[PDB]
Short mmCIF file of C-alpha atoms and ligand atoms in Angstrom, two decimals:
data_model
loop_
_atom_site.label_atom_id
_atom_site.label_comp_id
_atom_site.label_asym_id
_atom_site.label_seq_id
_atom_site.Cartn_x
_atom_site.Cartn_y
_atom_site.Cartn_z
CA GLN S 1 -8.77 22.23 11.32
CA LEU S 2 -6.53 19.12 11.11
CA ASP S 3 -6.08 16.71 14.04
CA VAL S 4 -2.46 16.96 15.28
CA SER S 5 -3.17 15.43 18.69
CA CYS S 6 -1.81 11.91 17.99
CA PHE S 7 1.85 12.84 18.19
CA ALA S 8 4.00 14.68 20.80
CA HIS S 9 4.80 18.35 20.07
CA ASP S 10 7.31 18.91 22.88
CA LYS S 11 9.60 15.86 22.84
CA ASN S 12 12.18 16.96 20.24
CA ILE S 13 11.32 14.02 17.96
CA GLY S 14 12.60 14.45 14.42
CA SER S 15 12.84 12.16 11.38
CA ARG S 16 16.00 11.85 9.27
CA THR S 17 14.11 10.46 6.32
CA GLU S 18 15.12 12.15 3.06
CA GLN S 19 12.95 15.17 2.13
CA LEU S 20 10.31 15.30 -0.47
CA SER S 21 9.78 19.07 0.04
CA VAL S 22 10.65 21.78 2.50
CA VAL S 23 8.73 24.94 3.28
CA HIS S 24 8.34 27.22 6.32
CA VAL S 25 4.90 27.29 8.05
CA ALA S 26 3.33 28.79 11.13
CA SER S 27 2.03 25.59 12.82
CA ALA S 28 2.15 21.77 12.95
CA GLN S 29 -1.33 21.74 11.44
CA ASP S 30 -0.15 23.72 8.42
CA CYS S 31 2.76 21.28 7.99
CA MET S 32 0.29 18.41 7.98
CA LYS S 33 -1.77 20.25 5.38
CA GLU S 34 1.43 20.56 3.23
CA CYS S 35 2.00 16.82 3.62
CA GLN S 36 -1.58 16.00 2.64
CA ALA S 37 -1.19 18.06 -0.56
CA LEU S 38 1.64 15.77 -1.75
CA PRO S 39 0.54 12.31 -2.89
CA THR S 40 3.65 10.51 -1.61
CA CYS S 41 4.10 12.35 1.70
CA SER S 42 3.90 9.77 4.48
CA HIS S 43 5.04 11.97 7.42
CA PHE S 44 6.59 15.32 8.30
CA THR S 45 8.90 16.97 10.77
CA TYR S 46 8.04 20.47 11.86
CA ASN S 47 10.39 22.58 13.98
CA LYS S 48 8.71 25.02 16.33
CA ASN S 49 11.88 27.23 16.47
CA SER S 50 13.00 27.44 12.84
CA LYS S 51 9.39 27.03 11.59
CA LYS S 52 10.75 24.54 8.96
CA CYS S 53 8.33 21.88 7.71
CA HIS S 54 10.11 18.91 6.10
CA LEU S 55 7.76 16.66 4.17
CA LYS S 56 8.92 13.05 3.71
CA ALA S 57 7.94 9.97 1.63
CA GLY S 58 10.05 7.14 3.12
CA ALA S 59 9.59 5.36 6.46
CA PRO S 60 10.27 7.55 9.50
CA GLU S 61 13.87 7.42 10.90
CA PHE S 62 13.46 8.84 14.42
CA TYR S 63 16.11 10.94 16.19
CA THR S 64 16.36 13.76 18.69
CA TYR S 65 16.59 17.38 17.65
CA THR S 66 15.62 20.41 19.64
CA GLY S 67 12.17 21.74 18.82
CA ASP S 68 11.23 18.94 16.37
CA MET S 69 7.91 17.19 16.21
CA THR S 70 7.11 14.39 13.81
CA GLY S 71 3.64 13.77 12.58
CA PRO S 72 1.93 11.35 10.24
CA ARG S 73 0.21 12.23 6.96
CA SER S 74 -2.99 12.07 9.06
CA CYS S 75 -3.83 11.05 12.63
CA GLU S 76 -6.85 9.14 11.30
CA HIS S 77 -4.75 5.93 10.87
CA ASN S 78 -5.33 4.27 14.19
CA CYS S 79 -5.30 0.55 13.31
CA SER S 80 -2.68 -1.44 15.29
CA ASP S 81 -3.29 -5.26 15.19
CA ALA S 82 -2.90 -6.08 11.48
CA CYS S 83 -3.49 -3.16 9.20
CA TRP S 84 -3.65 -3.32 5.41
CA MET S 85 -2.82 -0.22 3.38
CA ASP S 86 -5.65 -1.04 0.97
CA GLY S 87 -8.08 -1.95 3.80
CA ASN S 88 -9.06 -5.43 4.99
CA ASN S 89 -11.87 -6.07 7.46
CA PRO S 90 -11.48 -8.99 9.90
CA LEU S 91 -13.38 -12.17 9.07
CA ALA S 92 -14.27 -12.30 12.71
CA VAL S 93 -13.65 -10.35 15.92
CA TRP S 94 -14.24 -12.05 19.26
CA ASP S 95 -13.57 -11.38 22.93
CA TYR S 96 -11.30 -14.24 24.00
CA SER S 97 -10.59 -13.03 27.55
CA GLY S 98 -9.24 -15.88 29.65
CA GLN S 99 -8.24 -17.91 26.54
CA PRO S 100 -4.84 -18.69 25.19
CA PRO S 101 -3.81 -17.38 21.78
CA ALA S 102 -3.57 -21.04 20.62
CA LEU S 103 -7.42 -21.02 20.72
CA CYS S 104 -7.41 -18.10 18.31
CA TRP S 105 -4.99 -20.12 16.14
CA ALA S 106 -7.62 -22.91 16.45
CA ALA S 107 -10.36 -20.48 15.28
CA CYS S 108 -8.29 -19.57 12.26
CA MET S 109 -7.53 -23.26 11.50
CA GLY S 110 -11.27 -23.97 11.60
CA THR S 111 -12.38 -20.97 9.58
CA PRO S 112 -12.16 -21.32 5.81
CA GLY S 113 -10.41 -18.36 4.23
CA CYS S 114 -8.38 -17.56 7.39
CA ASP S 115 -4.71 -16.98 6.64
CA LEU S 116 -3.68 -15.17 9.82
CA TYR S 117 -4.94 -13.98 13.17
CA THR S 118 -4.12 -11.40 15.78
CA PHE S 119 -4.52 -11.64 19.54
CA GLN S 120 -3.89 -8.13 20.94
CA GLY S 121 -5.58 -7.68 24.34
CA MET S 122 -7.14 -11.15 24.26
CA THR S 123 -9.28 -10.19 21.29
CA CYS S 124 -9.19 -12.88 18.59
CA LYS S 125 -9.31 -11.42 15.11
CA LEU S 126 -9.23 -13.51 11.93
CA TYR S 127 -8.14 -12.31 8.53
CA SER S 128 -8.02 -13.44 4.96
CA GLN S 129 -5.22 -12.01 2.80
CA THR S 130 -6.49 -9.64 0.11
CA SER S 131 -6.02 -9.64 -3.68
CA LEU D 1 1.87 -32.74 26.09
CA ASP D 2 1.72 -29.19 27.46
CA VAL D 3 -1.83 -28.56 28.71
CA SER D 4 -1.01 -25.46 30.75
CA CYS D 5 -1.99 -22.73 28.26
CA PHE D 6 -5.70 -23.08 29.07
CA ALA D 7 -7.77 -23.11 32.25
CA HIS D 8 -8.91 -26.45 33.70
CA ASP D 9 -11.15 -25.15 36.48
CA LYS D 10 -13.30 -22.47 34.80
CA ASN D 11 -16.08 -24.59 33.28
CA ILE D 12 -15.29 -23.49 29.74
CA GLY D 13 -16.98 -25.55 27.00
CA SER D 14 -17.27 -25.18 23.26
CA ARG D 15 -20.53 -25.87 21.37
CA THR D 16 -18.78 -26.48 18.06
CA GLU D 17 -20.18 -29.56 16.28
CA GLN D 18 -17.85 -32.44 17.14
CA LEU D 19 -15.86 -34.69 14.90
CA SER D 20 -16.12 -37.42 17.49
CA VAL D 21 -16.29 -38.16 21.19
CA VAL D 22 -14.05 -40.58 23.11
CA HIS D 23 -13.39 -41.26 26.82
CA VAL D 24 -10.03 -40.47 28.41
CA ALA D 25 -8.62 -39.82 31.90
CA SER D 26 -6.98 -36.42 31.34
CA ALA D 27 -6.91 -33.20 29.25
CA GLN D 28 -3.51 -34.27 27.99
CA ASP D 29 -4.95 -37.55 26.68
CA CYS D 30 -7.80 -35.56 25.07
CA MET D 31 -5.27 -33.32 23.35
CA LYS D 32 -3.49 -36.44 22.09
CA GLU D 33 -6.80 -37.64 20.56
CA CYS D 34 -7.21 -34.24 18.94
CA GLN D 35 -3.71 -34.43 17.44
CA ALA D 36 -4.54 -37.87 15.89
CA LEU D 37 -7.28 -36.27 13.73
CA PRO D 38 -6.04 -33.96 11.02
CA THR D 39 -8.92 -31.46 11.22
CA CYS D 40 -9.21 -31.21 15.01
CA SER D 41 -8.63 -27.57 15.95
CA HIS D 42 -9.73 -27.81 19.53
CA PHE D 43 -11.39 -29.96 22.13
CA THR D 44 -13.55 -29.82 25.20
CA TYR D 45 -12.69 -32.40 27.89
CA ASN D 46 -15.01 -32.86 30.87
CA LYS D 47 -13.60 -33.72 34.35
CA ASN D 48 -16.76 -35.51 35.37
CA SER D 49 -17.99 -37.33 32.29
CA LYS D 50 -14.41 -38.13 31.18
CA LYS D 51 -15.66 -37.32 27.64
CA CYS D 52 -13.24 -35.79 25.15
CA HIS D 53 -15.10 -33.90 22.41
CA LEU D 54 -12.94 -33.33 19.33
CA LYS D 55 -13.91 -30.35 17.14
CA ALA D 56 -12.95 -28.98 13.75
CA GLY D 57 -14.61 -25.57 13.48
CA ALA D 58 -13.91 -22.35 15.38
CA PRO D 59 -14.60 -22.45 19.10
CA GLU D 60 -18.05 -21.46 20.40
CA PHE D 61 -17.43 -20.85 24.04
CA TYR D 62 -19.99 -21.35 26.78
CA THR D 63 -20.17 -22.42 30.41
CA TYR D 64 -20.72 -26.06 31.42
CA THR D 65 -19.71 -27.61 34.69
CA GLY D 66 -16.45 -29.54 34.62
CA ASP D 67 -15.59 -28.50 31.04
CA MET D 68 -12.25 -27.32 29.85
CA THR D 69 -11.47 -26.30 26.26
CA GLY D 70 -8.04 -26.65 24.81
CA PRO D 71 -6.40 -26.07 21.45
CA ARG D 72 -4.88 -28.80 19.20
CA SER D 73 -1.55 -27.77 20.82
CA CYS D 74 -0.61 -25.09 23.34
CA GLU D 75 2.52 -24.45 21.22
CA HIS D 76 0.67 -22.15 18.86
CA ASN D 77 1.39 -19.22 21.15
CA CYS D 78 1.94 -16.37 18.68
CA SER D 79 -0.19 -13.37 19.66
CA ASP D 80 0.84 -10.41 17.46
CA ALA D 81 0.22 -10.97 13.67
CA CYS D 82 0.33 -14.76 13.21
CA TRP D 83 0.20 -16.36 9.71
CA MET D 84 -0.95 -19.99 9.71
CA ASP D 85 1.83 -20.73 7.19
CA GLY D 86 4.45 -18.36 8.66
CA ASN D 87 5.63 -14.97 7.36
CA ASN D 88 8.83 -13.09 8.21
CA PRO D 89 8.58 -9.31 8.48
CA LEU D 90 9.93 -7.01 5.86
CA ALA D 91 11.07 -4.73 8.68
CA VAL D 92 10.96 -4.44 12.46
CA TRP D 93 11.49 -1.01 14.03
CA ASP D 94 11.45 0.62 17.44
CA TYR D 95 8.60 3.10 17.39
CA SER D 96 8.30 3.49 21.25
CA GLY D 97 6.03 6.41 22.03
CA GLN D 98 4.69 6.84 18.50
CA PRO D 99 1.06 6.79 17.29
CA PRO D 100 -0.05 3.83 15.12
CA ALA D 101 -0.34 6.35 12.25
CA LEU D 102 3.48 6.66 12.08
CA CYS D 103 3.72 2.90 11.60
CA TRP D 104 1.11 3.29 8.82
CA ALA D 105 3.52 5.94 7.43
CA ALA D 106 6.41 3.46 7.62
CA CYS D 107 4.34 0.95 5.56
CA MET D 108 3.28 3.61 3.05
CA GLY D 109 6.93 4.59 2.69
CA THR D 110 8.30 1.04 2.31
CA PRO D 111 7.92 -0.59 -1.13
CA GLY D 112 6.47 -4.09 -0.81
CA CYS D 113 4.68 -3.23 2.48
CA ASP D 114 1.08 -4.48 2.32
CA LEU D 115 0.30 -4.23 6.02
CA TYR D 116 1.70 -3.38 9.42
CA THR D 117 1.39 -4.46 13.03
CA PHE D 118 2.02 -2.05 15.93
CA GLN D 119 1.39 -3.69 19.31
CA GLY D 120 3.76 -2.54 22.05
CA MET D 121 6.72 -0.46 20.83
CA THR D 122 7.54 -2.42 17.67
CA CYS D 123 6.34 -1.33 14.25
CA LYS D 124 6.47 -4.41 12.01
CA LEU D 125 6.01 -4.31 8.22
CA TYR D 126 4.88 -7.25 6.10
CA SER D 127 4.19 -8.20 2.53
CA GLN D 128 1.50 -10.77 1.99
CA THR D 129 2.64 -14.37 1.46
CL1 CL P 201 18.86 10.06 18.93
CL1 CL P 202 4.37 -0.38 -2.83
#
Protein backbone atom coordinates (compact mmCIF):
# COMPACT_ATOMS: atom_id res chain seq x y z
CA GLN A 1 0.00 0.00 0.00
CA LEU A 2 1.33 3.45 -1.02
CA ASP A 3 0.14 6.68 0.64
CA VAL A 4 -1.81 8.73 -1.95
CA SER A 5 -3.60 10.89 0.63
CA CYS A 6 -1.45 14.04 0.26
CA PHE A 7 -2.94 15.18 -3.02
CA ALA A 8 -6.53 15.78 -4.25
CA HIS A 9 -8.10 13.02 -6.38
CA ASP A 10 -11.25 14.88 -7.43
CA LYS A 11 -10.09 18.38 -8.44
CA ASN A 12 -9.16 17.77 -12.10
CA ILE A 13 -5.53 18.79 -11.47
CA GLY A 14 -3.18 17.72 -14.24
CA SER A 15 0.46 18.47 -15.07
CA ARG A 16 1.63 19.45 -18.56
CA THR A 17 5.21 18.48 -17.84
CA GLU A 18 6.71 16.40 -20.65
CA GLN A 19 6.33 12.62 -20.17
CA LEU A 20 8.97 10.23 -19.12
CA SER A 21 6.65 7.21 -19.62
CA VAL A 22 3.00 6.45 -20.11
CA VAL A 23 1.10 3.34 -19.13
CA HIS A 24 -2.50 2.52 -18.16
CA VAL A 25 -3.17 1.45 -14.53
CA ALA A 26 -6.12 0.69 -12.31
CA SER A 27 -5.48 3.21 -9.48
CA ALA A 28 -3.55 6.31 -8.34
CA GLN A 29 -1.52 4.06 -6.07
CA ASP A 30 -0.41 1.93 -9.00
CA CYS A 31 0.60 5.10 -10.89
CA MET A 32 2.71 6.14 -7.92
CA LYS A 33 4.30 2.69 -7.90
CA GLU A 34 5.15 3.19 -11.64
CA CYS A 35 6.72 6.55 -10.80
CA GLN A 36 8.77 5.07 -7.95
CA ALA A 37 10.16 2.41 -10.33
CA LEU A 38 11.72 5.13 -12.53
CA PRO A 39 14.76 6.88 -11.04
CA THR A 40 13.98 10.29 -12.53
CA CYS A 41 10.20 10.34 -12.02
CA SER A 42 9.38 13.33 -9.83
CA HIS A 43 5.56 13.29 -10.18
CA PHE A 44 2.69 11.76 -12.14
CA THR A 45 -0.74 12.54 -13.51
CA TYR A 46 -3.30 9.79 -13.38
CA ASN A 47 -6.69 10.09 -15.09
CA LYS A 48 -9.54 8.26 -13.39
CA ASN A 49 -11.55 8.13 -16.69
CA SER A 50 -8.97 7.13 -19.29
CA LYS A 51 -6.92 5.20 -16.67
CA LYS A 52 -3.75 6.81 -18.21
CA CYS A 53 -0.76 7.24 -15.89
CA HIS A 54 1.74 9.82 -17.18
CA LEU A 55 5.05 9.70 -15.35
CA LYS A 56 7.10 12.92 -15.42
CA ALA A 57 10.67 14.06 -14.56
CA GLY A 58 10.50 17.88 -14.80
CA ALA A 59 8.86 20.33 -12.39
CA PRO A 60 5.06 20.11 -12.30
CA GLU A 61 3.17 22.50 -14.69
CA PHE A 62 -0.36 22.54 -13.23
CA TYR A 63 -3.52 22.86 -15.33
CA THR A 64 -7.13 21.73 -15.31
CA TYR A 65 -8.28 18.60 -17.08
CA THR A 66 -11.31 16.52 -16.32
CA GLY A 67 -10.58 13.48 -14.19
CA ASP A 68 -6.87 14.27 -13.62
CA MET A 69 -5.05 13.97 -10.34
CA THR A 70 -1.41 14.86 -9.86
CA GLY A 71 0.71 13.17 -7.28
CA PRO A 72 4.30 13.34 -6.12
CA ARG A 73 6.88 10.55 -6.40
CA SER A 74 5.99 9.92 -2.72
CA CYS A 75 3.83 11.67 -0.13
CA GLU A 76 6.62 11.20 2.43
CA HIS A 77 8.22 14.57 1.46
CA ASN A 78 6.55 16.86 3.92
CA CYS A 79 9.25 19.45 4.66
CA SER A 80 8.12 23.05 3.94
CA ASP A 81 10.40 25.71 5.59
CA ALA A 82 13.76 25.12 3.88
CA CYS A 83 14.18 21.67 2.48
CA TRP A 84 17.37 20.27 0.99
CA MET A 85 17.17 17.47 -1.57
CA ASP A 86 20.21 15.80 0.01
CA GLY A 87 18.96 16.41 3.59
CA ASN A 88 20.08 19.12 6.02
CA ASN A 89 19.06 19.20 9.67
CA PRO A 90 18.56 22.61 11.32
CA LEU A 91 21.37 23.87 13.54
CA ALA A 92 18.69 24.93 15.93
CA VAL A 93 14.89 24.93 16.22
CA TRP A 94 13.23 27.25 18.71
CA ASP A 95 9.73 28.46 19.56
CA TYR A 96 9.89 32.22 19.00
CA SER A 97 6.19 32.98 19.59
CA GLY A 98 5.71 36.68 20.26
CA GLN A 99 9.10 37.57 18.68
CA PRO A 100 9.85 39.32 15.46
CA PRO A 101 11.68 37.49 12.69
CA ALA A 102 14.54 40.03 13.10
CA LEU A 103 15.32 38.18 16.39
CA CYS A 104 15.70 34.96 14.41
CA TRP A 105 18.00 36.90 12.04
CA ALA A 106 19.85 37.93 15.26
CA ALA A 107 20.11 34.24 16.30
CA CYS A 108 21.61 33.37 12.94
CA MET A 109 24.04 36.35 13.12
CA GLY A 110 25.18 35.11 16.52
CA THR A 111 25.46 31.44 15.64
CA PRO A 112 28.66 30.39 13.90
CA GLY A 113 27.96 28.31 10.82
CA CYS A 114 24.50 29.89 10.25
CA ASP A 115 23.97 30.94 6.65
CA LEU A 116 20.17 31.24 6.62
CA TYR A 117 17.10 30.97 8.80
CA THR A 118 13.41 30.35 8.45
CA PHE A 119 10.57 31.79 10.52
CA GLN A 120 7.41 29.88 9.52
CA GLY A 121 4.79 30.00 12.30
CA MET A 122 7.08 31.93 14.65
CA THR A 123 9.45 28.99 14.86
CA CYS A 124 13.07 30.12 14.42
CA LYS A 125 15.14 27.58 12.54
CA LEU A 126 18.83 28.04 11.71
CA TYR A 127 20.70 26.32 8.93
CA SER A 128 24.17 25.90 7.60
CA GLN A 129 24.52 25.32 3.85
CA THR A 130 25.72 21.81 3.01
CA SER A 131 28.69 20.58 0.94
CA LEU B 1 15.16 53.96 14.55
CA ASP B 2 12.17 51.63 14.17
CA VAL B 3 11.62 49.88 17.53
CA SER B 4 8.11 48.63 16.77
CA CYS B 5 8.89 45.05 15.66
CA PHE B 6 9.26 43.83 19.25
CA ALA B 7 7.16 44.06 22.41
CA HIS B 8 8.04 46.68 25.03
CA ASP B 9 5.59 45.63 27.74
CA LYS B 10 6.01 41.84 27.99
CA ASN B 11 9.01 41.56 30.32
CA ILE B 12 11.10 39.73 27.76
CA GLY B 13 14.82 39.47 28.61
CA SER B 14 17.72 37.60 27.10
CA ARG B 15 20.37 35.83 29.22
CA THR B 16 22.99 35.90 26.48
CA GLU B 17 26.41 36.94 27.83
CA GLN B 18 26.73 40.67 27.14
CA LEU B 19 29.31 42.54 25.17
CA SER B 20 28.74 45.55 27.37
CA VAL B 21 26.17 47.46 29.37
CA VAL B 22 25.41 51.19 29.08
CA HIS B 23 22.60 53.47 30.37
CA VAL B 24 20.13 55.10 27.99
CA ALA B 25 16.63 56.62 28.14
CA SER B 26 14.88 54.53 25.45
CA ALA B 27 14.83 51.25 23.48
CA GLN B 28 15.65 53.26 20.39
CA ASP B 29 18.81 54.63 22.05
CA CYS B 30 19.69 51.06 23.12
CA MET B 31 19.31 49.88 19.53
CA LYS B 32 21.61 52.71 18.45
CA GLU B 33 24.25 51.45 20.93
CA CYS B 34 23.82 47.96 19.52
CA GLN B 35 24.36 49.25 15.96
CA ALA B 36 27.65 50.94 17.04
CA LEU B 37 29.16 47.52 17.91
CA PRO B 38 29.85 45.28 14.95
CA THR B 39 28.99 41.99 16.70
CA CYS B 40 25.84 43.11 18.54
CA SER B 41 22.99 40.89 17.33
CA HIS B 42 20.46 41.92 19.90
CA PHE B 43 19.88 43.79 23.12
CA THR B 44 17.80 43.80 26.25
CA TYR B 45 16.82 47.27 27.51
CA ASN B 46 15.17 47.65 30.91
CA LYS B 47 12.49 50.34 31.53
CA ASN B 48 13.34 50.60 35.19
CA SER B 49 17.09 50.24 35.44
CA LYS B 50 17.61 52.19 32.18
CA LYS B 51 20.33 49.58 31.42
CA CYS B 52 20.98 48.61 27.81
CA HIS B 53 22.62 45.18 27.59
CA LEU B 54 24.32 44.60 24.23
CA LYS B 55 24.71 40.95 23.17
CA ALA B 56 26.51 39.05 20.44
CA GLY B 57 25.27 35.46 20.67
CA ALA B 58 21.84 34.01 19.91
CA PRO B 59 19.03 35.17 22.16
CA GLU B 60 18.22 33.21 25.34
CA PHE B 61 14.80 34.43 26.23
CA TYR B 62 13.43 34.62 29.76
CA THR B 63 11.09 36.76 31.83
CA TYR B 64 12.36 39.74 33.87
CA THR B 65 10.31 42.70 34.93
CA GLY B 66 10.66 45.78 32.75
CA ASP B 67 12.82 44.00 30.13
CA MET B 68 12.39 44.25 26.42
CA THR B 69 14.58 42.46 23.87
CA GLY B 70 15.17 43.85 20.45
CA PRO B 71 17.21 42.91 17.41
CA ARG B 72 20.16 44.93 15.98
CA SER B 73 17.54 46.37 13.57
CA CYS B 74 13.84 45.69 13.06
CA GLU B 75 14.50 45.91 9.29
CA HIS B 76 15.60 42.30 9.10
CA ASN B 77 12.01 41.23 8.60
CA CYS B 78 12.36 38.31 6.16
CA SER B 79 10.43 35.30 7.46
CA ASP B 80 10.39 32.63 4.71
CA ALA B 81 13.91 31.33 3.73
CA CYS B 82 16.29 34.17 4.61
CA TRP B 83 20.02 34.03 3.68
CA MET B 84 22.24 36.31 5.77
CA ASP B 85 24.05 37.28 2.55
CA GLY B 86 20.99 37.26 0.25
CA ASN B 87 19.96 34.68 -2.37
CA ASN B 88 17.53 35.09 -5.27
CA PRO B 89 15.34 32.11 -6.11
CA LEU B 90 15.91 29.96 -9.12
CA ALA B 91 12.15 29.82 -9.54
CA VAL B 92 8.94 30.99 -7.87
CA TRP B 93 5.70 29.16 -8.69
CA ASP B 94 2.06 29.16 -7.66
CA TYR B 95 1.42 25.80 -6.04
CA SER B 96 -1.86 26.83 -4.21
CA GLY B 97 -3.55 23.74 -2.86
CA GLN B 98 -0.61 21.39 -3.42
CA PRO B 99 1.22 19.19 -0.88
CA PRO B 100 4.83 20.15 0.02
CA ALA B 101 5.87 16.92 -1.78
CA LEU B 102 4.97 18.48 -5.17
CA CYS B 103 7.34 21.36 -4.43
CA TRP B 104 9.97 18.72 -3.56
CA ALA B 105 9.13 17.28 -7.03
CA ALA B 106 9.66 20.71 -8.61
CA CYS B 107 13.14 20.88 -7.00
CA MET B 108 14.00 17.32 -8.03
CA GLY B 109 12.94 18.19 -11.57
CA THR B 110 14.84 21.50 -11.79
CA PRO B 111 18.60 21.27 -12.48
CA GLY B 112 20.55 23.43 -10.04
CA CYS B 113 17.82 23.15 -7.35
CA ASP B 114 19.43 22.30 -4.00
CA LEU B 115 16.48 23.15 -1.79
CA TYR B 116 12.94 24.46 -1.74
CA THR B 117 10.66 26.54 0.45
CA PHE B 118 6.87 26.07 0.45
CA GLN B 119 5.15 28.35 2.98
CA GLY B 120 1.76 29.65 1.83
CA MET B 121 0.97 29.00 -1.85
CA THR B 122 4.40 29.73 -3.32
CA CYS B 123 6.87 26.97 -4.15
CA LYS B 124 10.31 28.59 -4.30
CA LEU B 125 13.43 26.84 -5.61
CA TYR B 126 17.00 27.77 -4.68
CA SER B 127 20.56 26.82 -5.38
CA GLN B 128 22.99 27.31 -2.55
CA THR B 129 25.11 30.49 -2.63
CL1 LIG C 1 -5.90 25.94 -16.17
CL1 LIG D 1 20.67 18.72 -10.31
